[PDB]
Write a protein that binds this ligand. Structure first.
Ligand SMILES: CC(O)(O)NCCCCN
Ligand SMILES: [K+]
Ligand SMILES: [K+]
Ligand code: NA
Ligand SMILES: [Zn+2]
Length: 643
C-alpha cells in the first residue's frame, strides 16, 4: 500500500509575467509560486515530500480538452512581440500572454499529469502540484481568468483514459467558479464537479447565470455538477464547513470516487483581494482532511488561484501538512453559517434532491491590510499511535505504532484511585488496564511524542470513568465521547465539559443538548445511515464543540455492522489535534487491527455502494437535528424561521 506525498514544482513556471499595465491581471504574479514553495521549505514540508519532476503536456494530451484551433493560436505566442501579445490577450477575458506562457502552460499541465500518474501508480499516496498558469477557467477554445489550458480537466480525462476510472470527484475550492471544468464535464456522469464560489447574485466574475445552484449538469450528467454560490463576501470557517458537512461530503461518500482531484485556489482564504472571504488558512487543513478517506486517500491537489502572498503561503502549508498526515489544528469559534450561506445551502440541497440519496427526503412532504494570527506549528508525533492489546497478544503493527510499561508514579495513582472510588476492585486485569489508560493518556496529553491510542479493556464502567476523569484533570477543557453500545455510562453531561455521542440499538429519548443518541434500525442499510449521521450530525456538533480529547468506546456486544468504524476514526481525528483514545471492550483482532490502522493515519478502504438509508433512520436523524440545531448552529442546513 502506497506511502508518501508528491510535491511537483519547477521554478520555470515563475518565468512569465504581465508586461503592460492592467489592473485586472496585475495580481497574478510569479511570486505566488516562489512564496508558496519557500513557505513549504521554511516549514520543512518540501523536504518531506517526494519531488516529482514536471514535464510538458503533449499535443495529444492538450487536445483532450482543447480544440486544435485554440492550441494552434496559443502555439504562436512564443513568436510574438509585446504589441502582438497585448492584441492577442485582448481577444480573451482577464488573461495576459507572454513569450514564455505557452511553455509554462504545457509545464503546468504536464506537472498535473505527473501528479496523476504518481498517485494512480501507487508511487505516492497523494500529492500537490504548485503550478502557473492556473487552469479551471480556461475553456475548449478560450483562455480565461489567467488560465490558458485546463490542468484539472486534463487530469480527470487523462485518468479516465489511461486508468479506466469510472468515478472521479473534482473539488474546486477556489473562490471563483471553474466554468471551464463545468462545461467540460457537464454531460458526463463519470466526473462529479463541486464548486463553491463568490457569486453575489451573478455580479461577481465570471458573471455567468450557469454558475448558479440550478446548474446540476445536463443529460446523463444531471446531478453530477454542484454549484454553491456565495452571495455575500466575508464567508467564515463555519460557512465552509457547513458546505462540506451538508452538501459536498454527503454527495462525495455516496458517489464513492476512485480518484479525488482538488482545484485548490486559496483566494478563498482571509486577506485575499479577490475573494474577500474570512476563512483562516487552518480551514484548508480540514477541507483536505475531510476528503482524505475517499478513494483510499488518492488525492491530487492542483494549485489554482490565491493572491495574498501571506495567506497563500500559510494555506499551502496547511494543505501539505494534512497530505503528509500531520495533526490538524483545532478550529475555535465555530457556529451557524450565516443566513446567506444557509440560503445557498438549502437551495442547492433542494435542487439536488432528485439526484442524491442524502437529500431525497427533502423532495416529499411525508419525508420532510487584513491581519490574522499566525498558524501554530503542526508537529507529527514521534510515535503516532500506542496500542495495548490483551496480555500476551502480539500483533504486527504499522511503522508509526508501538506497544504500551506501567511506571512507578502511574502505579501509585491507580492505587489512590482504587482506594477512593473502587474499594472492592482487586481484579488485576482491570487494574492493569487502568495503568495502561493513564500511561497512554499521559503520553498523549503531556507530550508531542504520542498522538493517540487504543487500549483493549475488560470492564467498561471502571475504565471509562478512569479515562474520563483523568483527562478532565490533565486538564482537558472539553472531552467528546463517542460510544458504540447500549446502556448508560459513568458520564455526566451536565457541566458543558463533555459531549456524548451514543450509537445504540434501543430507542431512547434523550433530554438535553449535550447528548446525541442515534438508534439505527438493524439491516442492510446500517452503513449508509451511519455515514449520513456521521457527516450530517456527529461531525458538525463535534467541530463546534471543539474537544481537547476524543474518547471512543465500543462495547463487546456491538463489535459484529461496524464497517464504518475506520471512516469515523479517520474523520474524528480532525478534532482535538487527532488526540483520540479508543477503548475496545474484549479482544477482536479485526476491530483492533482496523482501529490501529485508522488511528495511525493509514489509508481507509472505500465503502463502495450501499443500500440507501432507511426512511425511519432519516426521520430519526432529522428529529435530532431539529432538537440540537438551536444550540449547535453548525447543524443547520436551512435558514431559520424568524419570529
Ligand atoms: C484562477 C482564478 O480562478 O483565480 N482566476 C481569477 C480570475 C480573476 C478575474 N478578474
Ligand atoms: K470554485
Ligand atoms: K459531470
Ligand atoms: Na483585457
Ligand atoms: Zn480564483
Amino acid at each position: 500500500a502506497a506511502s508518501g506525498s508528491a510535491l511537483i514544482f519547477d521554478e520555470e513556471m515563475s518565468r512569465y509575467k504581465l508586461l503592460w499595465t492592467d489592473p485586472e491581471c496585475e495580481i497574478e504574479v510569479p511570486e505566488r509560486l516562489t512564496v508558496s514553495y519557500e513557505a513549504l521549505r521554511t516549514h520543512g514540508l518540501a523536504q518531506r515530500c517526494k519531488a516529482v519532476p514536471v514535464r510538458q503536456a503533449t499535443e495529444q494530451e492538450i487536445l483532450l480538452a482543447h480544440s486544435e484551433e485554440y492550441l494552434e493560436a496559443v502555439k504562436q505566442t512564443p513568436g510574438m512581440n509585446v504589441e502582438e501579445l497585448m492584441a492577442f490577450s485582448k481577444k480573451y477575458n482577464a488573461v495576459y500572454f507572454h513569450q514564455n506562457i505557452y511553455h509554462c502552460a504545457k509545464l503546468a499541465a504536464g506537472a498535473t499529469l505527473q501528479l496523476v500518474d504518481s498517485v494512480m501508480k501507487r508511487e505516492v499516496r497523494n500529492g500537490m502540484a504548485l503550478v502557473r498558469p492556473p487552469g479551471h477557467a480556461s475553456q475548449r477554445s478560450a483562455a480565461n481568468g489567467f488560465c490558458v489550458f485546463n490542468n484539472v480537466a486534463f487530469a480527470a480525462l487523462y485518468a479516465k483514459k489511461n486508468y479506466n476510472l469510472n468515478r472521479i470527484l473534482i473539488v474546486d475550492w477556489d473562490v471563483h467558479h471553474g466554468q471551464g471544468i463545468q462545461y467540460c464535464f457537464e454531460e458526463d456522469p463519470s466526473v462529479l464537479y463541486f464548486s463553491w464560489h463568490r457569486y453575489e447574485h451573478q455580479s461577481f466574475w465570471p458573471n455567468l447565470p450557469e454558475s448558479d445552484y440550478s446548474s446540476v449538469g445536463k443529460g446523463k450528467g444531471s446531478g453530477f455538477n454542484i454549484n454553491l454560490p456565495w452571495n455575500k463576501v466575508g464567508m467564515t470557517n463555519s460557512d465552509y464547513l457547513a458546505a462540506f458537512f451538508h452538501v459536498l461530503l454527503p454527495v462525495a461518500y455516496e458517489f464513492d470516487p476512485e480518484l479525488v482531484i482538488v482545484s485548490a485556489g486559496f483566494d478563498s482564504a482571509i486577506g485575499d483581494p479577490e475573494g474577500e472571504m474570512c476563512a483562516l488558512p487552518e480551514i484548508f487543513a480540514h477541507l483536505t482532511h475531510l476528503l482524505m478517506p475517499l478513494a483510499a486517500g488518492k488525492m491530487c491537489v492542483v494549485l489554482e488561484g490565491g493572491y495574498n502572498l501571506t495567506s497563500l503561503g500559510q494555506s499551502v502549508c496547511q494543505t501539505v501538512h494534512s497530505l503528509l498526515g500531520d495533526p490538524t489544528p483545532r478550529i475555535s469559534g465555530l457556529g451557524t453559517a450565516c443566513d446567506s450561506a444557509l440560503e445557498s445551502i438549502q437551495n442547492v440541497r433542494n435542487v439536488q434532491s432528485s439526484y442524491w440519496s442524502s437529500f431525497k427526503h427533502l423532495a416529499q412532504s411525508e419525508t420532510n491590510d487584513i491581519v490574522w494570527p499566525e498558524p501554530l506549528k503542526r508537529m507529527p508525533a514521534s510515535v503516532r499511535t500506542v496500542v495495548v492489546p490483551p496480555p500476551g497478544v502480539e500483533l504486527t503493527l504499522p511503522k508509526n505504532c508501538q506497544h504500551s510499561d506501567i511506571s512507578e508514579s502511574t502505579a501509585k495513582e491507580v492505587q489512590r484511585i482504587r482506594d477512593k472510588h473502587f474499594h472492592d476492585l482487586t481484579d488485576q486485569n482491570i487494574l492493569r488496564s487502568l495503568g495502561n489508560i493513564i500511561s497512554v493518556l499521559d503520553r498523549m496529553m503531556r507530550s508531542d511524542e504520542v498522538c493517540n491510542g487504543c487500549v483493549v479493556v475488560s470492564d467498561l464502567s471502571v475504565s471509562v470513568q478512569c479515562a474520563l476523569q483523568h483527562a478532565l484533570t490533565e486538564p482537558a477543557e472539553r472531552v467528546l465521547v463517542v460510544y458504540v453500545g447500549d446502556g448508560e455510562l459513568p458520564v455526566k453531561t451536565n457541566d458543558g465539559k463533555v459531549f456524548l455521542v451514543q450509537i445504540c440499538t434501543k430507542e431512547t429519548e434523550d433530554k438535553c443538548v449535550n447528548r446525541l443518541t442515534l438508534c439505527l434500525r438493524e439491516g442492510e442499510s446500517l452503513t449508509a445511515g451511519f455515514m449520513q449521521a456521521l457527516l450530517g450530525l456527529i461531525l458538525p456538533v463535534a467541530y463546534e464543540f471543539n474537544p481537547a480529547l476524543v474518547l471512543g468506546i465500543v462495547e463487546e456486544t456491538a463489535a459484529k455492522l461496524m464497517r464504518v468504524w475506520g471512516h469515523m476514526t479517520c474523520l474524528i481525528q480532525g478534532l482535538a489535534r487527532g488526540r483520540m483514545l479508543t477503548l475496545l471492550q474484549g479482544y477482536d483482532k479485526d476491530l483492533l487491527e482496523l482501529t490501529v490502522s485508522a488511528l495511525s493515519g493509514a489509508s481507509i478502504s472505500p465503502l463502495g455502494p450501499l443500500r440507501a438509508p432507511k426512511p425511519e433512520d432519516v426521520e430519526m436523524m432529522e428529529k435530532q437535528r431539529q432538537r440540537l440545531q438551536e444550540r449547535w448552529g453548525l447543524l443547520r442546513c436551512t435558514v431559520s424561521e424568524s419570529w
